[PDB]
Structure 1
């Protein structure tokens, strides 16, 4: 899980398909922008591809 409250990692346009997984998906725009999603399993899927990539901190 661990997805409740996540701020973007730090990267402009460079990925290929993960951008849908995040910016176009999760709802993150520009770095540092944090989003707070629910705390259920279904969401972990998105952060996984971007594991060390994104930043979920607490």
Structure 2
């Protein structure tokens, strides 16, 4: 089962960890609907940058 993630904020004034985490999720620009395989890890990544992403 896959989960659709969407970037909902800019990655400008953000920590290197958070800039990395979006590269790990595969989100490039704001409003980028990327779907990933649901695991304990990806939910951790989404948890790490929850403020700037939205799950479907």
TM band (smaller chain):
0.7 to 0.9
More helix by share: 2
Per the normalisation by structure 1, the TM-score is 0.71
Residue 54 (structure 2) aligns with: 55
For the Cα contact (< 8 Å) 1:3–1:43, is it kept in 2? no
Range that drifts further, 18-27 or 7-16: 18-27
For the Cα contact (< 8 Å) 2:8–2:54, is it kept in 1? yes
Per the normalisation by structure 2, the TM-score is 0.73
Consecutive unaligned residues in structure 1, runs of 5 or more: none
Distance in structure 2 (CA, Å) of the matches to 1:3 and 1:16: 27
More strand by share: 2
Distance in structure 2 (CA, Å) of the matches to 1:17 and 1:3: 27
Matched residue pairs, number? 56
For the Cα contact (< 8 Å) 1:19–1:25, is it kept in 2? no
Consecutive unaligned residues in structure 2, runs of 5 or more: none
